[PDB]
Amino acid sequence: EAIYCDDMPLVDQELFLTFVTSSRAHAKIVSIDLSEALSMPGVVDIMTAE
Amino acid sequence: NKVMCHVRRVGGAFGGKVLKTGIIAAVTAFAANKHGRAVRCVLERGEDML
Amino acid sequence: ASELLFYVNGRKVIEKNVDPETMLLPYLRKKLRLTGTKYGCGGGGCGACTVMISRYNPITKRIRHHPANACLIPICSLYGAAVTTVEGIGSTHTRIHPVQERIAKCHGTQCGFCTPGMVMSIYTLLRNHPEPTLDQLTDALGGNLCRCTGYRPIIDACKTFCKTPKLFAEEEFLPLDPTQELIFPPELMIMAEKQSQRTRVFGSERMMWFSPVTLKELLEFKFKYPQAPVIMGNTSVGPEVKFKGVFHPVIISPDRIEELSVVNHAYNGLTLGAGLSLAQVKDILADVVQKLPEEKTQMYHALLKHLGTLAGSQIRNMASLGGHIISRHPDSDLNPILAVGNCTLNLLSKEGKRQIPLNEQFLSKCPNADLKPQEILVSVNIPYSRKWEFVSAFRQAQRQENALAIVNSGMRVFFGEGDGIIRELCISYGGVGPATICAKNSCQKLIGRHWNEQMLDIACRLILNEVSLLGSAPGGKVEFKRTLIISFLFKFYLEVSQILKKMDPVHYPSLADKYESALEDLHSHHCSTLKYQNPKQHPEDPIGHPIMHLSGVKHATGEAIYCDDMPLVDQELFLTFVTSSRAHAKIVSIDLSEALSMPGVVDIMTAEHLSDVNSFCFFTEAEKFLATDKVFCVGQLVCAVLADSEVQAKRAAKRVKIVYQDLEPLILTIEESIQHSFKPERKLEYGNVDEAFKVVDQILEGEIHMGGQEHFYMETQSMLVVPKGEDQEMDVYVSTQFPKYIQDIVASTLKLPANKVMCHVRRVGGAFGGKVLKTGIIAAVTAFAANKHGRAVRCVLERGEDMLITGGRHPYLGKYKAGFMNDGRILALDMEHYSNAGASLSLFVIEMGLLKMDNAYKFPNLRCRGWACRTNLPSNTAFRGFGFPQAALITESCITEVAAKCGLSPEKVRIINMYKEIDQTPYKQEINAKNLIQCWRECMAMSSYSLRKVAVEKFNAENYWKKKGLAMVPLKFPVGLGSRAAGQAAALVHIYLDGSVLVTHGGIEMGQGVHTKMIQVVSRELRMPMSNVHLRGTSTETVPNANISGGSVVADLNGLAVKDACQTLLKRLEPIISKNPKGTWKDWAQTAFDESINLSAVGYFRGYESDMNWEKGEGQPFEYFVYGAACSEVEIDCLTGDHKNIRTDIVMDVGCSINPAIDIGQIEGAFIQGMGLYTIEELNYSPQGILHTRGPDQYKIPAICDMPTELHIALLPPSNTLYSSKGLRESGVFLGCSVFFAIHDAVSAARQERGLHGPLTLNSPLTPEKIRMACEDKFTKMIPRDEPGSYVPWNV
Amino acid sequence: HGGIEMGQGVHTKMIQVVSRELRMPMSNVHLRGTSTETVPNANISGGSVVADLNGLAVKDACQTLLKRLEPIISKNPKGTWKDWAQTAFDESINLSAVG
Ligand SMILES: Cc1cc2nc3c(=O)[nH]c(=O)nc-3n(C[C@H](O)[C@H](O)[C@H](O)COP(=O)(O)OP(=O)(O)OC[C@H]3O[C@@H](n4cnc5c(N)ncnc54)[C@H](O)[C@@H]3O)c2cc1C
Ligand code: FES
């Protein structure tokens, strides 16, 4: 019965946020392709640094 | 005065729920305000340690 | 098999396999999460759910915008349409629309619940007329009600769009940019261009829905299911679905059919399609009457007359012409006009055409003159009138517009070839029976006579015998309805005899010179002037400035979240109640079998299911929540149905079968309660009255009854109760005034300590005392159900439910015996007060009544007694004024009665008996009435009284059937609570390290702008702009033990507590501010944190001292007094009963006004709310105790047409209170009795001219039923009366 | 208070402080959580002194309340905590305090 943070009931129309993380220890980001991911089911928005 | 923070209980912390947690909450509230919806962000274990 | 497609705020809305019973208003709120559109009454008469529907006609290649009430629109009728709501036209994150900016900055928002409906009506009209006239804007707002603002500031914002010291800067408003309005969705424009001919089928397990788009297909569906109605605007069958228990399994709703919306200009007349809206019909008729000669536009003028008073703009734009005819409402405003001028109906069947005439047998629904169930109505033909043919229409309701008629009529006469003989005659009456009837026998026995008074008298006694109303006729007002039938005949005889005089002057005589006023109609124009004070104060000090309500623009954009506006929480359940249907009976059995098995039902609770927690004590005697074995009034809580959804809840509630056995005695009236144990008496005496009754000249006995009142807050009882799931923690979100009381009754019900139950209130859409005791009872059983099933429960009552469960104002009865001399001075006055308390007890109302009964009159010898009476009616609650509008009326009624016995005007009798500058109240409290006499003198000069008194006497002597009246009353409103502990307030203030401040206090924002005034206090006491301060709401988790937020001192007391916390913080920070006076508030709070200074503080004010020894009768219970005077002018219609508020002049002593914009709005709202209490607001009860709520019995609050055409308010120029201010929200309610005596004076002028001296005992409210029956004439004595004991009446 | 319950039982220790400083059982005291809307400018809840520092602040608020109530407690030392808080409301005594 102890309610933790994720134990809170799902509020109306709430969205979920996941991150993509770096896969290299020291590199330069030359391109980020959000085309295929933006069109996938349920996707509302994908935010980058800009 | 427009942003309030509520914490009932934490399932262990040991110093690991401050700087990086605020960074996640920063971008989570930014997405929440942009789309006018509530956003929930819960990391998996592999995501968390990384 | 079909899909539903439409647009809302530019976004596409697709819905697959819809439930055809889904209405637009619950769809916008629960499915689209657009809570801006509010729920008001559910009948379409309030306008709180006003939205804009937009269609594209591909044939004309133009877009048609029209307003509509969303609570009556089924979403299946919106295919291809574009809905626009408050959120669509603008918001705070995007662009604020000028309509939203101006109605908010003109201070046209208080509680803000009706604001979304006001904004959409103004926006829709500006989309049809970008450069409008004020006349067009007031007609659009005719269907929108408001209980707070008094409509004055909304009219000011409307004037801003017209090309015709203040509280707002009009020059700073955005100019209405017509270029960047909302573009019509282009996808719908392409859809309309492709005329798809396929009919759409929507179905569910309960109802099928067919939308044929071609006339051929429509005729096929009307043949398949002849019983299925043809839904057009849903304004006739819609209301019957909700409250009248009708249900149609099959529904036909045709789309736009070109054959059904035809308007042709023929040679014999015009034929209009049955699919045109009543608003469209008046537009083509208003066009033709200025294009055709006046001899042929006779019928159309009669239709345009009643279409202007026909409901509101939204209902007119939904209701159809054919729907109006087929509905055949007994109180129809259009059927009697069409029945008297040979109108034909073009019926079309699948077998062929047919044309029947619209006559008597059709409106009576005789099957021979009716439609066959297989044919539809396509169009109706209205012919041109001929020369020497004249028709006129009449009506009379509770108010001028948006009110069902009591009796209306349409009459046509024809002479021909230019001689004063009648060849054709046809008259009709509505509201006198189950259907519109025509006196065919009366018109038969009169053909051939001449127009004269000798024929008219025989036409009356003939008509009165034909159309007969039994004494037990529904709708009541039988003696009034008998007279209106005659008076309309007299007005008709006067009208057409004037048309004959204008056309053939030599043959016909000129009318009586004293009779011409009877032909003028009381038509409005709205002017308003406000005067207040506005040097040596800092420009950043906001005290005294007209600062806009903080939630103002939030009220205008729909972003203000009210209680039911809260998002639906996970798995929440809905709770509805079943209420008592008998006034006094024994519960013999309750059958929950069928209801428990219905879909969605989770639980149904009766009295036994609560056991020991079915009673809470309000510190007098315990009152029970749910009825046990007996019921004591209608609307008492019996069961509580708990279901998965609101719809499934009410459905099971209507299937709960309860059997009764009536008990005796059935007490209803005050005197019926006085007949039957022991009652706690209360009395105060001043001097000796028995000794003065022998030294005065005359002794006058009299009494006056006063009816009750409904709060009619725009937001009904709403609450959500959410269990936390730990330690039985419960958070209640209620629309209430007393969060501490909600916390107590819920904790007591759940047998939990107070620390486990918290109460949260952000804002309330009006309360007026009606959201306390009964609200806590509902919250008690709602939290009980929530804890039992471990789910969140929401309980929102409908309007009909609300008025039946909630009480209202206390109906009063005041008996008095006055000893006075011929100079007008009153020496001896004995008084008795009686209050219809209801089912349970109320002493505080009687107490505050006796203490405030003196008003502004020094009675040297006074004895005043009061009592409360148990009746079998819903228990009433404290209102605005706390008994003052009743105790001060019986004294003014007394003063008016001695003025008649003295021959002097009431104003001279009032000033003679007035207090001196320094004087003593009956309770031995001194007063400084220096501002009292100054209010009376300035009101006389500001209104130019004597110049207008002689002019009214000139009017009464010149006019016989129209009279004017004038009156002026003084005001002394004492302000104070019972003890010091009741005026105690607290607050909590935080200062964050960025410099921002968060403040909270125990007050509840109900529209009085308490939150706005508190931020003004923080801004001055901390020397920071209000933009730095913020407030979220009121919660028992932050400010404990808060007192009730009702009365005039809510802002004053909490203002002192917030001032105490700011001073506490400012003193801790004085070392830091002095050492760095240039730094901002941010580095002040940062160095305070660095130096370990606490930046949080509790404010507290112990309350004003107050004591009263009710045994001796003396005490000091009032901190200050509010003085003022009001002068009102009225013109009444002697025949009908109608009246028009001409001008009202108000002066008030508020002292140093902390917010003059908010304080003036409270004066206007209190006056209009009081004006309705004395004039139009009437509660109709049956002899069995059942409240009537349908038809002409509908409760009506003041609308725009009822606001005085000219209103003047001045604030008297100006220290124990906060900033030398004075609370005044309850004062103006009594100032609304000036119009009551203005109508009383006008009635006296009609009784004096006709010689009817005697007891003019006019009771409250002064409804048109009581106005007309006081103006006795030949028609008054002519009506057939009934003996008292034969019939069982419909009312009283 | 400004402390965060992470398993160190800070909330449990605070109720123990309220129980001693106000002479009432813990069953009478309750705590819901931590919120910036109630206790502003709270320090980080990490380290050994989280319960110690917040324990002194809760002890300060209980003493502040207990001193305001000393006239009422002395004039009726037998009465419960309910009629103490009721007469405090009747005598216009503020029953809320900041530690
Ligand atoms: C707030 C409110 C205020 C009102 N005030 C007034 C007032 O002041 N004075 C007054 O006189 N009335 C008043 N009314 C009543 C209103 O005028 C009628 O309800 C309206 O005119 C009926 O038109 P409708 O489109 O709503 O018909 P619907 O509600 O859609 O249907 C009603 C009946 O008419 C039938 N029908 C509709 N069209 C056709 C057709 N072509 N062919 C055959 N049958 C058809 C339907 O089958 C149905 O049985 C008020 C109503 C409301 C809700
Ligand atoms: S007018 Fe639609 S809700 Fe009252």
Ligand code: FES
């Ligand atoms: S209804 Fe307009 S503010 Fe209360």
